[PDB]
Design a protein around this ligand. Structure first.
Ligand SMILES: NC(=O)C1=CN([C@@H]2O[C@H](COP(=O)(O)OP(=O)(O)OC[C@H]3O[C@@H](n4cnc5c(N)ncnc54)[C@H](OP(=O)(O)O)[C@@H]3O)[C@@H](O)[C@H]2O)C=CC1
Length: 416
């Protein structure tokens, strides 16, 4: 069904546990500004192709909107709106002076060359210039966008802006040479590790030697497993990808599995590990389960089979609303997705702060600040969950929507 409708339904279902006026709810149920533009580029054959670009700013009560740009053939304005709405709550829950934004281009980037990709990024910046800026809207990498495209976009924005202000802060996730930030590549996994470590403290479980199963082995999942092994002292016993999964009760080495995957395409048939499927990985007896591949992997048809103490929603929306109640019934602590993977946007905020301040931090300072922020956010959400006797997802919504609502009231946008 429609992604924006599902996001609105999640907001409405959460709103029953908080005291928010109906006018504020109606304000929050629709994006404040939506921009749809034509993005023309000159192809390598000389023809001019026009692409459809999107730029959604859901709410900027707490500050400039924040959100990445995704390049995808199945990209829809409804998906952009839903993701911007979720970005609002994600920045609100970790207490950032940000609002929620999202961008997208309907394009198959695999059919474009390097020059065509650079032209597409520059044309997108030239088209959405009037609604973005260091204090207006800060994009970032997302699906099929990378630091290289971010650098191209930053250069185009600086050329248009005539270097009048800090042009580095218009976009995050850029290379370290042009105002990048240390700790960006492991941001999401590091934040997820911090939240898992705090959840173990909440449940009174010592993680030094426990089992973790990670679904997905991209930038997020592989680093989640690596940091869980080295920082949390855990034993990775199962990793998977779009092809299949592997299992090893003794433990798996994330670096070796990554090297094997880079060579044979997938992680399957890893030396000394049972082969499994993606569905069997979720139902494996582990202490922490971290789905980080796609959305809606845990539904009402397989939630009774989850036997992990902690479910770390590293991916976006990997658990259906109907499965939340089933998981909570069995006694499983779940870390909501827009809280578990907020480390990426937190480090993006740190990069933006460094850009607008003209002063850049070291790796240790970035990691320490991220640890403080993630620990505080998790404990706020968990205390709200415990006091109000509601689901962790509902508690995170209560925390984020309350902040956005208070900002809206203080601005005078809503009088009630
Ligand atoms: N910055 C980040 O990393 C952030 C991550 N997230 C979420 O985490 C998820 C993954 O992030 P990221 O690592 O960047 O993504 P990548 O595209 O880098 O990797 C995704 C991984 O998922 C695997 N996968 C794809 N489809 C399936 C499937 N049907 N079953 C099992 N595994 C599958 C892929 O395997 P294969 O290699 O074979 O394709 C790949 O290993 C996304 O949902 C994303 O929104 C959340 C916020 C930010």
């Amino acid at each position: 069904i429609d992604p924006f409708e599902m996001a609105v339904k999640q907001l409405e279902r959460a709103a029953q546990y908080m005291d928010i006026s109906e006018e504020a709810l109606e304000w929050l149920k629709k994006p404040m500004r939506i921009v749809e533009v034509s993005v023309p580029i000159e192809m390598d054959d000389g023809s001019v192709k026009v692409f459809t670009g999107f730029r959604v700013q859901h709410n900027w009560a707490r500050g400039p909107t924040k959100g990445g740009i995704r390049w995808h053939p199945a990209e829809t304005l409804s998906t952009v709106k839903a993701l911007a709405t979720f970005m609002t709550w994600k920045v609100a829950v970790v207490d950032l002076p940000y609002g929620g934004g999202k961008g997208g281009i309907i394009v198959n980037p695999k059919e474009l060359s390097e020059r065509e990709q650079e032209r597409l990024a520059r044309a997108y910046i030239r088209a959405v210039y009037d609604v973005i800026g260091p204090w207006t809207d800060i994009p970032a990498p997302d699906v099929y966008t990378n630091p290289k495209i971010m650098g191209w976009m930053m250069d185009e924005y600086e050329t248009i802006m005539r270097r009048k202000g800090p042009a580095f802060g218009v976009i995050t996730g850029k290379p370290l040479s042009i105002g990048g930030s240390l700790g960006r590549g492991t941001a999401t996994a590091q934040g997820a590790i911090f939240t898992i470590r705090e959840a173990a403290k909440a449940l009174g479980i010592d993680l030094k030697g426990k089992k973790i199963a990670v679904q997905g082995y991209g930038n997020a999942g592989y680093y989640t497993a690596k940091l869980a092994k080295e920082q949390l002292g855990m034993t990775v016993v199962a990793v998977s990808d779009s092809r299949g999964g592997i299992y090893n009760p003794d433990g798996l080495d994330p670096d070796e599995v990554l090297k094997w995957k880079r060579e044979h395409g997938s992680v399957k048939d890893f030396p000394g590990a049972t082969n499994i499927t993606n569905e069997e990985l979720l139902e494996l007896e582990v202490d922490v389960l971290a789905p980080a591949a796609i959305e809606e992997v845990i539904t009402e048809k397989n939630a009774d089979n989850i036997k992990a103490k902690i479910v770390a929603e590293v991916a976006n929306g990997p658990v259906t609303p109907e499965a939340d109640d089933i998981l909570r019934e069995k006694g499983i602590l779940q870390i909501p997705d827009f809280l578990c993977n907020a480390g990426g946007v937190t480090v993006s905020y740190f990069e933006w702060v460094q850009n607008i301040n003209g002063y850049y931090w070291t790796e240790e300072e970035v990691r320490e600040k991220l640890d403080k922020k993630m620990t505080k956010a998790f404990w706020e959400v968990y205390n709200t969950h415990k006091d109000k006797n509601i689901h962790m997802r509902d508690a995170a919504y209560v925390v984020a929507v309350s902040r956005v609502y208070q900002a809206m009231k203080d601005r005078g946008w809503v009088k009630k």
